[PDB]
């Protein structure tokens, strides 16, 4: 079995460092331990120590396993059930279970094997009516908060771990349910495995179970020994219980000074540093002084769940092809017919302008869902499912490409012919690709800056404000060779300057706007004209320049949005 | 004191419809009475239905308060806890208690008597160390769910009603606040106040306190009587305890069948009707058989409250004025000095156009704060807090018209005088009345599409494509005199064409755009030529009338929102 020990840990957070927990030390042998204490006491936080979820740079003691210090493969051997559920709303019960079994569990198991492993942890968990219905999300109402903190602790028990860490396993869950999983885990620490939770308001008959006891309050440490124990050990100090049928509210009544025998806190903490138990594990603590699956598998499961939890939220992927699809009808209408007239130059400058900006702005609302999920993505890496790279690739393979760039593809064939631009292929399909590289060079921009920022107001205020800026160096609002030397610098740094240069260039090159033609000067018959006077060259070499800036972007951003992710506090 | 009762009560849910509470019969007396059952029984249901917060169609049954019907009062002399907390976060705990206080205790108490009021319940309930302190806020990290329940409990608490109903009161508080909060209820259960709660887990010591209870499961009424008696009911059946310390956890068991001696749900209330307990009930029941406060205070307070809100959330005020002088500053910089020349056209057009879109889509993000808050909208009329019109009106003058005037004003002060636009005060103010009306109108339809809207998302996206579709319209990208017929008639509806074209008649009416001058056709050296290519009348009544075309568009549009509001479903 698994031996887990701690000896003098204490914690400090920030300045002002202040310590959340104080002297500690125990051992949880295997078996079945518990942590109970107040609200605020430091439950959750002692876990996360002891399960490595916490910066070690406050802490300040020793962990160790069965003598030895911490694997490396302690978080390939652990599992951790969080406080406040992590649970992917678009997917069903079944497919989290299998999404942590695939990337967890070796993949020399057939994946029937699997399946039926999954199976059985449904059944044990009381999920099977729940088992392929849909957790909660905004538009699909869902289970109930306690069928949602049961499949938290499912994902975790798939992997079969000797080691065990849970938060509040029984919150939203009324006694019958909250018996059998206390049970489940009963029957799961008599094989070897080594079981630490924390727990409210247990019953007496669950409080038997309790192997080894822990009792924090306030940070410091007021008991740790066998449960059954406990009870004689504030006998003798007084409290004698005589009163409360359930001993555990007993324990927390005295730590709120609601019974008979400076602060209350310290005071008990005295007692127990010369108790017996302390004398007996410090004479203990004495004595005793990688994944699973590669790269492409979790590519390939990554851009699994990305597709299914796009398709979940309908106003992403859905609605934006339909907003395409009726823009560019109604645009076809509005524009049907442009004409080598006085109107024509102002018509074409104008859809030109549309198209471009709308590819920019559209892409704001697909990385907002990359924000929502920071907190997922920071429980998983840390669990150990899968590798930054592989969620940054898969998240692109599943999101941005391929919803992207079907727009410029649906833009292009519904407007070009209707409107009658440039009857040549050439001009089409360089239109659809243009329309391709701001899209893709906007998104990456996009995820630059919301990688890594966990409110969603911020990060989209910030990239509408991004591009509104760079909408106004267009070409169109203002003539770029008017501008003032000092500031017509960050012309370059705009995506639609280059689409418009580029789809510009494409359709005027070899118009005349004048119908029927002492040449009038003041006036732009031909196309050239235009193109000259609003700054742009002739050359071939304008149109490519503008396509390879929008490519060089992207890839400086998209490198960006990496080392953010790397870079980023997983702790 | 007040004796609640019940007879016969069936509701019904939908099509299919389902009853999720079948017969049901009981007398809630004065003292303290419970509702146990199990999660999804229908606690919370049965709790709505006798305060009236459900729809009264489903409902099946006669609800007697002291044998005469309900009166129209009962919300005046009632007060409701919901399961899940509604609770203003960007405001303090004490703010939120005098906002109850205000609007449901009347007025002839002086202010300080109410906040000495508000004192006592605080010190009560134990919320001194954060009386003060703010509610969660995403930006701010605020009090813990805990001391967030107990301020629920509290706004109620302050109207001192005759029947108060709970639902959960202890979820997410430890034993020791438990007991606190239920000792409260007892005391104040000892002068005549009759108090309804559903709870999870008791303990013994509070489950004695409970002097009539009710045991509801899968909508069906195991056992309605005294608590004490509860034992001896089920022992008589069968199920003698002599196992379990907490007797709670031995009704629950029995109802999930974990003990000894069609469906045990169906089998067990069968019991019930021929127990003595249901003929008492039955002999008895048989035999049984406006606001406070005025208009101008509502308003007042959720001005007040909604200046705070607003202020709380700094990306919808600060953020946007921020914004606001930054886009001035950099126009002024990008179009400073426009001439007289062949580009003075574009970048005027340009300029303007860009204003009022600014002014157009700014008006998204002000209403989203209305979505988010139609929960608590509709859990405070219900509470009989204040009426519709009151709600509407306050927060309209105090989050639409401060917010939404000054950025006009801003961006007239700052870009006029270094453009270089008309040197003219007349001008000057019709630019500012223009953007002001522009920015009132798009708030008023945003307003009109997202009430009523509980996701935030869909209203985003449905404002977004209704500005957009307006933009087309604008005069800019498109020129309105080249639009088919059957479709220009569409542009009568856009907002952004009445202030586009205000501001191109107010500015190029007298300019000359040909700096040396056979005339040269096809040039278009005037701006009142332009003004005529582009559709624009020359008369003054052209100005005039986009704005009266705006005027009349906001009344509509608010009215639609007060009436949506008005025919909501507040149930
Ligand atoms: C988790 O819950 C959620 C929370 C939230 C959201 C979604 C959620 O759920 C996931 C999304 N919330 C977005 C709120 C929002 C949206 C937009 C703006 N503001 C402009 O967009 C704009 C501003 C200008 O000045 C400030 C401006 O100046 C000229 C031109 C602007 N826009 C254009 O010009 C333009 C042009 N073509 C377009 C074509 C297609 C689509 C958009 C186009 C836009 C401001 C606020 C924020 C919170
Ligand atoms: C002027 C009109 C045309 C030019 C428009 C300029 C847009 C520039 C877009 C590329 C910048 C970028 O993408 O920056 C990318 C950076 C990269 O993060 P980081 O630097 O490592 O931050 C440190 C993060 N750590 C500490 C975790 C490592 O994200 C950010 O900084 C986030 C805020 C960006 C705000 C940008 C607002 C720009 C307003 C400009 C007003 C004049
Ligand atoms: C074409 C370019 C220029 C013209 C642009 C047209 C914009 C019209 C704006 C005023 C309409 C309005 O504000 O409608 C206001 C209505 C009022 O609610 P209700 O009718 O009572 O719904 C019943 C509600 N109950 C049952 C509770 C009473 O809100 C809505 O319907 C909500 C959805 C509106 C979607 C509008 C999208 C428009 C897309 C047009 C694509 C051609
Ligand atoms: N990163 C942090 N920054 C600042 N304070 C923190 C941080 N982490 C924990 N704390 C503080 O430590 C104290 C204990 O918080 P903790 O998360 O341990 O609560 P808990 O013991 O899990 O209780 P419960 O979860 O039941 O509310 C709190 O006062 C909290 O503010
Ligand atoms: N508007 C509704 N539409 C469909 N079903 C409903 C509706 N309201 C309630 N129900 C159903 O009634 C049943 C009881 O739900 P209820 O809200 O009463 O739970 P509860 O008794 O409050 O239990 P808890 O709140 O502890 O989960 C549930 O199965 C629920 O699906
Ligand atoms: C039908 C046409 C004319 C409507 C104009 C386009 C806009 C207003 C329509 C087109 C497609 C629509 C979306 C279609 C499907 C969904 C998914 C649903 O679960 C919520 C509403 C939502 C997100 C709709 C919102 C409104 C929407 C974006
Ligand atoms: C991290 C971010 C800000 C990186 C920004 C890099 C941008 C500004 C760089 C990437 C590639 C660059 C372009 C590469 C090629 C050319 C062609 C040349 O004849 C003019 C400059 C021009 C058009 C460059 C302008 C600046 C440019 C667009
Ligand atoms: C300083 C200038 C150049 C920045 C350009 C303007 C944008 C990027 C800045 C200007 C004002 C800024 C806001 C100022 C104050 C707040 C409140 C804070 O609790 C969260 C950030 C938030 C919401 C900021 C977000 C970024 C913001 C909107
Ligand atoms: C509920 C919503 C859709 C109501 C829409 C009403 C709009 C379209 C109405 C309100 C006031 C109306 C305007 C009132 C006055 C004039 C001046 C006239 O010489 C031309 C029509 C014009 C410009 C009207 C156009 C239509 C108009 C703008």
């Not at 967890?104 to 198991?109: G, K």
């Not at 409290?239 to 001993?247: D, K, S, V």
């Not at 770029?480 to 003032?484: F, G, Q």
């Given at each position: 079995g698994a031996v887990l020990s701690f000896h003098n840990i204490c914690y400090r957070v920030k300045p002002v460092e202040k310590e959340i927990l104080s002297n500690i030390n125990g051992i949880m042998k295997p078996g079945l331990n518990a942590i109970l204490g107040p609200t605020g006491g430091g439950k959750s936080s002692l876990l996360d120590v002891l399960a490595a979820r916490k910066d070690p740079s406050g802490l300040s003691g020793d962990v160790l396993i069965n003598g030895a210090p911490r694997p490396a493969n302690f978080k390939c051997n652990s599992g951790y059930v969080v406080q406040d559920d992590v649970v992917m709303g678009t997917l069903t019960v079944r497919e989290n279970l299998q999404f942590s079994a695939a990337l967890?569990?070796?993949?020399?198991?057939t994946n029937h094997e699997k399946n039926e492993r999954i199976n059985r942890v449904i059944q044990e968990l009381g999920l099977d009516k729940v088992a392929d219905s849909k957790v909660g999300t905004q538009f699909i109402r869902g289970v109930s908060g306690g069928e949602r903190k049961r499949t938290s602790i499912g994902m975790e028990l798939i992997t079969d771990p000797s080691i065990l860490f849970l938060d509040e396993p029984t919150t939203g869950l009324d006694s019958s349910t909250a018996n059998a999983v206390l049970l489940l885990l009963k029957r799961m620490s008599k094989q070897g495995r080594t079981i630490i939770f924390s727990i409210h308001q247990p019953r007496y008959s669950i409080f038997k179970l309790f192997d080894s006891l822990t009792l924090l309050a306030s940070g410091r440490l007021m008991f740790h020994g066998p449960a059954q124990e406990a009870l004689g050990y504030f006998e003798s100090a007084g409290?004698?219980?005589?009163?409360?049928?359930?001993?555990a509210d007993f324990f927390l009544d005295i730590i709120n000074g609601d019974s008979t025998a400076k602060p209350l806190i310290e005071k008990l903490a005295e007692i127990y540093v010369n108790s017996s138990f302390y004398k007996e594990t410090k004479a203990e603590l004495h004595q005793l002084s990688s994944y699973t699956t590669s790269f492409c598998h979790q590519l390939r499961w990554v851009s699994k769940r990305s597709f299914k939890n796009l398709l979940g939220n309908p106003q992403a992927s859905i609605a934006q092809i339909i907003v395409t699809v009726v823009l560019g009808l109604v645009i076809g209408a509005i524009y049907f017919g442009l004409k080598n007239d006085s109107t024509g130059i102002q018509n074409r400058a104008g859809v030109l302008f549309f198209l471009t900006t709308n590819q920019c702005f559209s892409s704001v609302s697909a990385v907002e869902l990359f924000v929502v999920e920071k907190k997922l993505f920071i429980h998983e890496y840390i669990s150990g499912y899968y590798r930054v790279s592989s969620y940054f690739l898969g998240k692109l393979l599943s999101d941005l490409l391929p919803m992207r760039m079907l727009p410029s593809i649906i833009f292009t064939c519904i407007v070009y012919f209707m409107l009658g631009l440039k009857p040549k292929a050439d001009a089409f399909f360089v239109m659809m690709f243009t329309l391709m590289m701001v899209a893709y060079s906007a998104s990456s921009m996009a995820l630059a800056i919301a990688a890594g920022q966990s409110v969603v107001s911020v990060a989209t205020l910030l990239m509408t404000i991004c591009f509104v800026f760079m909408m106004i160096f267009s070409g169109l609002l203002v003539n770029?060779?008017?501008?003032?030397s000092w500031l017509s610098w960050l012309q370059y740094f705009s995506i639609p300057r280059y689409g418009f240069t580029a789809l510009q260039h494409n359709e005027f090159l070899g118009q005349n706007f004048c119908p029927g033609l002492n040449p009038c000067n003041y006036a732009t018959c031909t196309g050239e004209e235009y193109l000259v006077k609003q700054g742009i060259?002739?050359?071939?070499?304008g149109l490519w320049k503008n396509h390879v800036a929008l490519a060089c972007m992207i890839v400086i951003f998209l490198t960006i949005a990496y080392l953010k992710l790397l870079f980023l506090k997983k702790y």
């Open positions: 967890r569990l070796a993949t020399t198991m409290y004698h219980c005589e009163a409360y049928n359930n001993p770029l060779t008017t501008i003032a060259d002739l050359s071939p070499w």
